[PDB]
Write an enzyme that holds these catalytic residues in place. Sequence first.
Site, PDB file in Angstrom:
ATOM      1  N   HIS A  40       0.811  -1.226   0.000  1.00  0.00           N
ATOM      2  CA  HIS A  40       0.000   0.000   0.000  1.00  0.00           C
ATOM      3  C   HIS A  40       0.833   1.259   0.000  1.00  0.00           C
ATOM      4  CE1 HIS A  40       0.313  -0.382   4.418  1.00  0.00           C
ATOM      5  NE2 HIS A  40       0.394   0.937   4.329  1.00  0.00           N
ATOM      6  N   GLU A  52      18.896   8.139   7.863  1.00  0.00           N
ATOM      7  CA  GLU A  52      18.264   9.274   8.526  1.00  0.00           C
ATOM      8  C   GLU A  52      18.106   8.933  10.006  1.00  0.00           C
ATOM      9  OE1 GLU A  52      14.921   8.859   5.987  1.00  0.00           O
ATOM     10  OE2 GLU A  52      14.995  11.058   5.490  1.00  0.00           O
ATOM     11  N   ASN A  54      17.105  12.272  12.257  1.00  0.00           N
ATOM     12  CA  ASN A  54      16.138  13.361  12.171  1.00  0.00           C
ATOM     13  C   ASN A  54      15.840  13.632  10.682  1.00  0.00           C
ATOM     14  OD1 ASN A  54      15.042  16.100  12.044  1.00  0.00           O
ATOM     15  ND2 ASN A  54      15.425  16.247  14.226  1.00  0.00           N
ATOM     16  N   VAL A  57      16.668  17.370   9.496  1.00  0.00           N
ATOM     17  CA  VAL A  57      18.061  17.887   9.558  1.00  0.00           C
ATOM     18  C   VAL A  57      19.088  16.871   9.039  1.00  0.00           C
ATOM     19  CG1 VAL A  57      19.929  18.596  11.176  1.00  0.00           C
ATOM     20  CG2 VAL A  57      17.571  19.381  11.536  1.00  0.00           C
ATOM     21  N   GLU A  62      23.822  10.515   5.395  1.00  0.00           N
ATOM     22  CA  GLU A  62      22.611  10.049   4.733  1.00  0.00           C
ATOM     23  C   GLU A  62      22.841   9.835   3.245  1.00  0.00           C
ATOM     24  OE1 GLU A  62      22.784  12.962   6.602  1.00  0.00           O
ATOM     25  OE2 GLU A  62      21.126  12.909   8.108  1.00  0.00           O
ATOM     26  N   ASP A  84       0.319  -7.787   1.518  1.00  0.00           N
ATOM     27  CA  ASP A  84       0.728  -6.378   1.617  1.00  0.00           C
ATOM     28  C   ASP A  84       2.258  -6.228   1.738  1.00  0.00           C
ATOM     29  OD1 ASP A  84       0.672  -3.638   1.716  1.00  0.00           O
ATOM     30  OD2 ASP A  84      -0.083  -3.584   3.825  1.00  0.00           O
ATOM     31  N   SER A 177       4.081   2.792   8.124  1.00  0.00           N
ATOM     32  CA  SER A 177       3.809   1.731   7.092  1.00  0.00           C
ATOM     33  C   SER A 177       5.032   1.392   6.308  1.00  0.00           C
ATOM     34  CB  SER A 177       2.638   2.128   6.170  1.00  0.00           C
ATOM     35  OG  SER A 177       1.405   1.597   6.674  1.00  0.00           O
ATOM     36  N   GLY A 178       5.277   0.087   6.103  1.00  0.00           N
ATOM     37  CA  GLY A 178       6.356  -0.435   5.271  1.00  0.00           C
ATOM     38  C   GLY A 178       7.647  -0.665   6.041  1.00  0.00           C
TER      39      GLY A 178
END
Lengths: 224, 58
Positions: A40, A52, A54, A57, A62, A84, A177-178
């Site tokens: 979904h 990541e 935050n 910021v 990253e 799903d 989600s995920g």
Amino acid sequence: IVGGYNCEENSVPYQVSLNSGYHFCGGSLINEQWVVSAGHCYKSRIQVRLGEHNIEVLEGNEQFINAAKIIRHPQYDRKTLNNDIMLIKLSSRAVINAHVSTISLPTAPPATGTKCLISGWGNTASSGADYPDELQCLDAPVLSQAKCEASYPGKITSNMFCVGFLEGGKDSCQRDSGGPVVCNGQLQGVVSWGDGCAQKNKPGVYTKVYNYVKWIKNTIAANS
Amino acid sequence: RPDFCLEPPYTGPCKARIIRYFYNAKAGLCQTFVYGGCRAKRNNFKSAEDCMRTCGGA
């Protein structure tokens, strides 16, 4: 995540976010070039962000990597939410270091009472909006099939399971989600759905990753 | 405008945070809301312009 805490630095280095102008879902890094998420969370264009802490910021390490392939399970059922799950192939290999690394697939299906770690940038409020910039973590147990089924009569397929607390107060929530449910170094669950968040007798429902191990392997092999 | 345009926005049970538009009949305007990713109702659009076109946002 409702009722969780700020994850320790570098404690969840397999957590990624899915982005389409803004952060909409989480995911788990399973391979230098592959991410597992929810069906979904499907969109036709997705930037994956890795490392990541935050999300507002940039801190140093990253990586932002565009999805080259976005592969929703072909039997995802838009009504019942069965199957799903979704694979993303990154357009470049992720750098693996202290802040970013992979999580293993499960060797067995989830076991009742197993202590697991759920993580994401989902809403921290069970009513209203309180979206956190810092990654949240939640220690939560696999609930018995009985309890999961009694919470959601008729709705819990063999490809789902529940993790959390029947008393309420602690759960995954919108924007989680995920993302991962990890138990003893294995990705057991994908954050999927629930009747709200952190309500009494309405624990979170998660996709049972074990049941997709062969689909995941075959799909990666076919697109390598 | 279709009757479905008069229904409240519906987040649903899934746990994405996908920003959608719904026609807000009380305010007379297409307004954002959080969709969870599954079980959308019809008053749920991917853009403001789709929402205005469908739900008579004159």
